Amino acid sequence: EVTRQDLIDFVVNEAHLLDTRRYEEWNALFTDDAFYWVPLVPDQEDGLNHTSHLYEDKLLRELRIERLKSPRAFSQQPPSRCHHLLQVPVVEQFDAEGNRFVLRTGFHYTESQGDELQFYVGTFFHHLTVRDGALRMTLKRVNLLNCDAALPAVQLFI
Amino acid sequence: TSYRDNPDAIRALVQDDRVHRDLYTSQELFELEQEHFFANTWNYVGHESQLPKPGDWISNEIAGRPLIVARHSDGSVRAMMNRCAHKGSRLVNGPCGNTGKFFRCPYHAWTFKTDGSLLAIPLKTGYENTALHECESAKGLTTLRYVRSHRGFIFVKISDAGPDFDDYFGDSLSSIDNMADRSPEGELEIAGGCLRFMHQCNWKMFVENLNDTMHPMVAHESSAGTAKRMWADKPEDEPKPMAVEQFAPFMSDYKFFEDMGIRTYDNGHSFTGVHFSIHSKYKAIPAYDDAMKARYGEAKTAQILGMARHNTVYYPNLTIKGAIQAIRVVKPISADRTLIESWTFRLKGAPPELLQRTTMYNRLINSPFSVVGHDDLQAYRGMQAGLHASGNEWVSLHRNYDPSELKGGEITTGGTNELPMRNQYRAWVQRMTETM
Ligand code: FES
Ligand SMILES: [Fe+3]
């Protein structure tokens, strides 16, 4: 009963949750064993034998979210803000029998803090599946164009 | 003040137990560091595994000079200016490559051997009755005399001033030996990528932080306290997530950090953790322990694995962490800009789990996405801004100051002592002023 538009709608809404600080609801979109992966190099093979910027399991996602609530998260005084602009997700793999779906989504991501602002462009790969009648992510991979460049602090979730 | 050609004003910035804020904020002093301090010191430029075969090269920059570090045909490492003898073009573009038997300038194709010497000039008869042969250019590229290696770690010094390599580093190089000895083959190779994190602060704030045991329970409280809260009421020997393992000790009592100890060296080197650790079964990798014994024997394996130096500073531009095979390179850009490049090594012959742990550490602590990195960068930017205040213009370095320390030499001291920072600026003043 999953449609291609439900898959697209999922990716659009995931970015909307991040831009509206709905981090607990966002985190619940992942399966408990999923990873949130921001590679360090183009065409990186895996997140186990090569460094990444982020390769976060559920514990690490929760740690980062809870830390943003702390009155002593000095690096978020004042809080950063973000914005995602998405190109329509493209469905690369649609396997209802195998309960497996893969989307490819271009993005422009902006993060600002006070009077400072940075932007990054890239492509998402979302691996989606149905668990208990609901779509969930088993992997979110964020390929930044300039992942291996000299980057300043990136403090929110792309 | 005008610090150029003014060594007395430079000396006045550094007292025995405090330094003036202009060390951190003055662009003029940054410019003078390129001419004096960074040119008169030994600086890490790369690892031999990055240029193992003849013709291999990497590019780098030290003290504002663009360099080539290259493997010559005799197997040695040579360093030279990435600056053509004709009109100054870089001979090589990008971070690394292999040039075969000679460099070739990509503007007019003068060629140079891999030791820098001039090889050929197109249409050489155009110089026949000219003074070119009388100029430095006729030699080829400017080459560095002061190029040395220790266990694959390559260092250079631009100028003729300052201590030579062996005296500059003394026994601090033993930290490098320990990291390489942790390979069952005694060899390291660069692997796993480079995290490149731009910091909007002076290089000195990053380097001081490496010896700063009073900051973690403050600057990392939100990160560490959060980690501790998600690992509550667990057996002490239950394997921890690495984030919990690494973050939670930031909140240790001051006594823990005091007891850890610091060793300082002449010329500003240091390491934290002066004790030997007993190798336990906690998170042991049997195949690795077996491979170590097979190579080194039981007694030497215990010695290698028992060294517990949490970090080592190779002043001014390198720090290493032995037991995790991570290094951080300091690339100063301006008075308020520093790039930190964080690299890792594979332990040759070790099972893949070792590089898995090291690359995980590198991500967790040293990425531009790391919350621990955000924590410390926030502190540095806070000082970078705050130090523009007037009134009190001094940075206090008084903690545990004792004039007996002025003798220098190797000193082992308490872990909260600000000695390594005081020692560093004593070296900085000498290296600054000796060529002024
Ligand atoms: S600048 Fe190199 S050959 Fe002319
Ligand atoms: Fe820190």
TrEMBL record, chain A:
Keywords: Dioxygenase, Oxidoreductase
A GO MF label: dioxygenase activity
A GO BP annotation: 3-phenylpropionate catabolic process
Keyword rRNA processing: no
Any Pfam family hit: Ring_hydroxyl_B
Family statement drawn from the similarity comment of this UniProt entry: Belongs to the bacterial ring-hydroxylating dioxygenase beta subunit family.
PANTHER family assigned: BLR3401 PROTEIN
Protein name per its UniProtKB record: Aromatic-ring-hydroxylating dioxygenase beta subunit
Organism: Variovorax paradoxus (strain S110)
Automatic annotation (TrEMBL), chain B:
GO molecular function, one term: iron ion binding
A Pfam family matched in the record: Ring_hydroxyl_A
Positions contributing to [2Fe-2S] cluster binding: C84, H86, K87, S89, C105, H108, W110
Domain Rieske, first and last residues per copy: 43-144
Residues reported in the UniProt entry to bind (indol-3-yl)acetate: N209, L210
UniProt entry keywords in alphabetical sequence: 2Fe-2S, Iron, Iron-sulfur, Metal-binding, Oxidoreductase
Binding site residues for Fe(3+): N209, H215, H220, D376
Highest taxon of source: Bacteria
Keyword Plastid: no
Protein name stated in the entry: Rieske (2Fe-2S) domain protein
